[PDB]
Design an enzyme around this catalytic site. Structure first.
Site, PDB file in Angstrom:
ATOM      1  CG  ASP A  66      86.423 -17.446  72.459  1.00 13.44           C
ATOM      2  OD1 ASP A  66      85.402 -17.288  73.266  1.00 13.44           O
ATOM      3  OD2 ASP A  66      86.777 -17.241  71.467  1.00 13.44           O
ATOM      4  CG  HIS A  83      84.573 -14.037  70.872  1.00 12.63           C
ATOM      5  ND1 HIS A  83      85.145 -15.275  70.326  1.00 12.63           N
ATOM      6  CD2 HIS A  83      83.912 -13.404  69.732  1.00 12.63           C
ATOM      7  CE1 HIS A  83      84.981 -15.273  69.080  1.00 12.63           C
ATOM      8  NE2 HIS A  83      84.043 -14.461  68.759  1.00 12.63           N
ATOM      9  CB  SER A 134      82.303 -15.089  66.496  1.00 12.46           C
ATOM     10  OG  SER A 134      83.200 -14.388  66.104  1.00 12.46           O
ATOM     11  N   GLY A 135      81.990 -18.537  67.239  1.00 16.13           N
ATOM     12  CA  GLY A 135      81.378 -19.381  67.965  1.00 16.13           C
ATOM     13  C   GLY A 135      80.765 -20.494  67.169  1.00 16.13           C
ATOM     14  N   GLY A 164      81.497 -12.593  62.436  1.00 17.21           N
ATOM     15  CA  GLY A 164      80.121 -13.299  62.167  1.00 17.21           C
ATOM     16  C   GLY A 164      80.090 -14.855  62.066  1.00 17.21           C
TER      17      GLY A 164
END
Ligand SMILES: Nc1cc(CNC(=O)[C@@H]2CCCN2C(=O)[C@H](N)Cc2ccccc2)cc(N)n1
Ligand SMILES: [Ca+2]
Length: 223
Positions: A84, A40, A177-178, A175
Site C-alpha cells: 500500500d 489506497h 491515510s497516506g 483521513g
C-alpha cells in the site's frame, strides 16, 4: 488522529495534505519533487498542499502544487492492502525552507519498541466523527510481529507493521491515510489500515517503507 495532540504549526514540515477539492489523505515529502502516500489514496486530480497547519485557512507558509503523475506500486493489492504505497510527482519543485522540508527514506527497518511520530488531519474520535483543521500528532511504539498477527489473524504480510496501543485510546484514523510514521528521522511507515480507530486489541497497521526503498529510488530516477 485519536488520542493525540496538536503538533504545532509547521513542526512536521514533511507532512503534506492531498486535496481534490477537499483534504482526503496525507503524504510525506521525500524530496523537492516527490511525495510518498498510500496506494489506497490514489485518485485523479490531486493537488499537493505543503506547509500546512490549518487546512481551511491560508496562513502564509503554504505551497499548492498540482500532481503531474501518480505511480501506484505495481503489486498493490486493494483487497489485502499489501504493498500500500504510491509515489506522486509534483508539476514543479517545492521551495524547501524551515516549514517545507523533506524526510529521509530509511536505510534499515525500524525495530519493535521504537517510538515513532504519526501525524495527520484525520478523525479525532473513536466513536463518531470530528475532523480537525490543524495538524494532529501521536507518539506510538512499533509493536511486535506476533502481537500484530494476533490482533489481525491471517491479514498481516511482511510489508506491514503495527504501531500503537493494544489498550486502545490512541491511534490514527480515517483521513490520516497516506501520512507519515517517522522514527529516528526516517520515514518508516505509511498510514494504511485497521479495524475501527483506537479500539482495544486493534492497533494501526502501516506500510513497511523500508521494503520499498529500492523501488522508490529506481522510480524517481526514471520519472
Ligand atoms: N481503522 C483505521 C484506519 C486507518 C486509515 N485507513 C483507512 O481508513 C482505510 C481506507 C479505506 C477504509 N480503511 C480501513 O482501514 C478499513 N477499516 C478497512 C478497509 C480498507 C480498505 C477498503 C475497505 C475497508 C488507520 C488506522 N490506524 N486505523
Ligand atoms: Ca493553511
Amino acid at each position: 488522529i485519536v488520542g493525540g495532540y496538536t503538533c504545532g504549526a509547521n513542526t512536521v514540515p514533511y507532512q503534506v495534505s492531498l486535496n481534490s477539492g477537499y483534504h482526503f489523505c496525507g503524504g510525506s515529502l521525500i524530496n523537492s519533487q516527490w511525495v510518498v502516500s498510500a496506494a489506497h489514496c490514489y485518485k485523479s486530480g490531486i493537488q499537493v498542499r505543503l506547509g500546512e497547519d490549518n487546512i481551511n485557512v491560508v496562513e502564509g507558509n503554504e505551497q499548492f502544487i498540482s500532481a503531474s503523475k501518480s505511480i501506484v506500486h505495481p503489486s498493490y493489492n486493494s483487497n489485502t492492502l499489501n504493498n500500500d504505497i504510491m509515489l506522486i510527482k509534483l508539476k514543479s519543485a517545492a521551495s524547501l525552507n524551515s516549514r517545507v522540508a523533506s524526510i529521509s527514506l530509511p536505510t534499515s527497518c525500524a525495530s519493535a519498541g521504537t517510538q515513532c511520530l504519526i501525524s495527520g488531519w484525520g478523525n479525532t474520535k473513536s466513536s463518531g466523527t470530528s475532523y480537525p483543521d490543524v495538524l494532529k500528532c501521536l507518539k506510538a511504539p512499533i509493536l511486535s510481529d506476533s502481537s500484530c498477527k494476533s490482533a489481525y489473524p491471517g491479514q498481516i504480510t511482511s510489508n506491514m507493521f503495527c504501531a500503537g496501543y493494544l489498550e486502545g485510546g490512541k491511534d490514527s484514523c480515517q483521513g490520516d491515510s497516506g501520512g507519515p510514521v517517522v522514527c529516528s528521522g526516517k520515514l518508516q511507515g505509511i498510514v494504511s489500515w485497521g479495524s475501527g480507530c483506537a479500539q482495544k486489541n486493534k492497533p494501526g497497521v502501516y506500510t513497511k517503507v523500508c521494503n520499498y526503498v529500492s523501488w522508490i529510488k529506481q522510480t524517481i530516477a526514471s520519472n
